[PDB]
């Protein structure tokens, strides 16, 4: 009967908890007690991007981290030259309710998706003067919350159907479905190696996935509420997780557990985007507050606040060169800080 | 400026002109979220309103009095709505259709309405409450086989409002049922509302040709109430 399996699941859950407690020989707060604080990390809106009509739901930097895609629910992807406040493209979407976008690391392609369960992929290097939709990946049975390119031809796509899927864009077909999530999958971050990725759901859990083996390598479950946002630490051995529970939490893969929790009783609202800085020492959490907070990822104190937005910081991305943190909001504005 | 830099400025200005054109098309298009349970006849209202003209969102677009409306029948999402519904924090209205007939399911519709209304982001979004299937409600109350007091015991003591309009010369008991169902959602909206958004109750059937006219009148009154608050006249 099912009760035997439920009991064995409880047994393995207790075993996992005991093993995690047996690895918890220290906490990062204690180990970070010996190293100097990062101080007041003030930063200023160097560039503000006025182009969108409606709220920005998602934003993502290119590899040569100058171009910036931004996706708004007026049905535009705008690509910005952040150095010049200059629109290099503006892509009209087949469905306004876009919720995710990414660059291909090659720069050649830009993806988006949303309430229409498709991942619309747009080729920027077409010979024509305007961008064309090169594939529309349509197999998901729920809205797409995050699409991230593994390469010029592979894209991984989290959906509210509780699954992620890895697509071959030339085939237009799911190579792998990642099926273990019980809740609406909300956020996806690739490891720097792109061999692993982690996705946070509306289960209070994050799952680590192997893109080759097609399997859930680990599950991280210290959160209380929906993990709206997830971001690998640049070492690739840890990742941060923003939630409706107003906490960020940093999970280390090899310790298989919460290494740190970032929280402040003045904050009673969810995190909607998360990014690390290039050293990993700053954790940048976009709150619904509508402020936007910098945490010392190691010390877990508030280094500073990017208090420039009047509505949710829906998206937050640090350049691959680390030179700026872009922030985007339901204000329709992207503000770029350093 | 360099030739490439000037050329980039020229392309950005072309894009800006197109964005200004799309701005006017966007601002002149009034977006609507159509919500309702499987019972609630939502599809029949989309199909009727199309006379005014596998995927995760169905856009039915219609025009009344040269006003363009985009109405989004959300479909084939999962039943966890707390994340996708955040998108519609900028629609003019939520058309919440309700099967007014199946009193057993009506409490689910009440809790769905309460979740829409209390939600931090929909906190500015008015709800066009289509109490649908009024023909079947009338049949059910006139047949008397089923008894609202068993599902909503406060109906044992609720008395028909002085604003009540038994339009087709319908029975007093049918009217009492109708306006009770109305006043449950009005109690939810009236108690918790902050005055930034309002509930627009309507009684309807699939056969109602006037449902586009109702949505026009409600969106008109919503934008009026929005501006009249902004001008501190209301």
């Amino acid at each position: 009967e099912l009760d035997q399996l439920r009991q064995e699941a409880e047994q393995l859950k207790n075993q996992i908890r005991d093993a995690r407690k047996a690895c918890a020989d220290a906490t990062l707060s204690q180990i970070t007690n010996n190293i100097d604080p990062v101080g007041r990390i003030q930063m200023r809106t160097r560039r503000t991007l006025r182009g969108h009509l409606a709220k920005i739901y998602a934003m993502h930097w290119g590899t040569d981290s100058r171009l910036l895609v931004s996706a708004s629910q007026d049905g535009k992807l705008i690509i910005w030259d952040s150095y010049t406040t200059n629109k290099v493209h503006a892509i009209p979407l087949r469905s306004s309710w876009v919720m995710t976008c990414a660059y291909a690391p090659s720069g050649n392609y830009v993806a988006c998706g949303g309430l229409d369960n498709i991942c619309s992929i747009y080729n920027l290097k077409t010979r024509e003067g305007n961008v064309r939709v090169s594939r529309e990946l349509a197999g998901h049975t729920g809205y797409l919350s995050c699409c991230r390119f593994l390469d010029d031809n592979q894209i991984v796509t989290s959906s509210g159907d509780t699954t992620c899927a890895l697509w071959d864009i030339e085939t237009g077909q799911q190579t792998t479905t990642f099926t273990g999530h019980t809740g609406d999958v909300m956020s996806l971050s690739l490891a720097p190696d792109t061999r692993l990725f982690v996705s946070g759901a509306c289960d209070a859990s994050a799952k680590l996935w192997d893109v080759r083996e097609g399997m859930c390598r680990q599950t991280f479950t210290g959160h209380e509420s929906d993990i709206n946002a997830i971001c690998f630490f640049p070492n690739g051995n840890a990742f941060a997780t923003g939630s409706d529970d107003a906490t960020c939490r940093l999970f280390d893969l090899r310790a298989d557990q919460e290494l740190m929790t970032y929280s402040h009783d003045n904050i009673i609202c969810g995190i909607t985007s998360v990014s690390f800085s290039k050293s990993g020492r700053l954790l940048l959490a976009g709150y619904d507050d509508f402020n936007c907070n910098v945490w010392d990822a190691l010390k877990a104190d508030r280094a500073g606040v990017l208090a420039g937005h009047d509505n949710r910081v829906s998206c937050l991305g640090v350049t691959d060169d680390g030179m700026a943190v872009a922030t985007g909001s339901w204000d329709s504005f992207l503000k770029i800080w350093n | 400026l360099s030739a490439e830099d000037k050329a980039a400025v020229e392309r950005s200005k072309m894009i800006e002109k197109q964005l200004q054109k799309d701005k006017q098309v966007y601002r002149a298009t009034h977006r609507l979220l159509l919500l309702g349970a499987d019972n609630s006849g939502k599809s029949t209202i989309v199909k009727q309103m199309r006379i005014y003209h596998t995927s995760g969102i169905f856009e039915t677009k219609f025009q009344v009095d040269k006003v363009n409306f985009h109405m989004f029948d959300v479909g084939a999402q999962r039943d966890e709505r707390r994340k996708w519904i955040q998108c519609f924090n900028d629609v003019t209205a939520i058309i919440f259709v309700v099967d007014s007939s199946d009193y057993n399911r009506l409490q689910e519709a009440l809790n769905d309405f309460k979740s829409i209304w209390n939600n931090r982001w929909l906190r500015t979004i008015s709800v066009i409450l289509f109490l649908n299937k009024q023909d079947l409600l009338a049949e059910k109350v006139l047949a008397g086989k089923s008894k609202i007091e068993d599902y909503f015991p406060e109906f044992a003591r609720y008395t028909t409002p002085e604003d009540a309009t038994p339009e087709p010369g319908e029975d007093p008991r049918v009217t009492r049922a109708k306006y009770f169902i109305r006043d449950e959602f009005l109690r939810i909206s009236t108690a918790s509302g902050d005055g930034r958004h309002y509930c627009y109750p309507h009684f309807t059937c699939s056969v109602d040709t006037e449902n586009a006219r109702r949505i026009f009148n409600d969106c008109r009154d919503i934008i009026q109430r929005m501006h009249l608050r902004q001008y501190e006249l209301l």
Partner: nanobody
Amino acid sequence: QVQLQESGGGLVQPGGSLRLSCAASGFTFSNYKMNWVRQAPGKGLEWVSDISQSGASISYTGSVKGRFTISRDNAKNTLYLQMNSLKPEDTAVYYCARCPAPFTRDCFDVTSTTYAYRGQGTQVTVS
């Protein structure tokens, strides 16, 4: 880990009284609006009752409103439902369901067929 282990079900006579209990764990229980939900056999997830963070507000479905009382102890992290006058209509797997987000008034998805923040549930049966 968020868990909502629940106990107090069984079999009762019509007109009997029962006391469901839900040992919430893994979340800051005081911050969350707590719901009871039930699934009668072959039916949907009927919502049953709701209690605010402080308990200063409560709500019920009319099928139970005069009959069940929802209560919480925020130090024990226990949610309760006393069922003073059970009826054969009440036979269901009950589930304590937490609101999704803390400090929040909209209890979305608590009735959703798969929802993370809900117990495995207690069966109530009535003769």
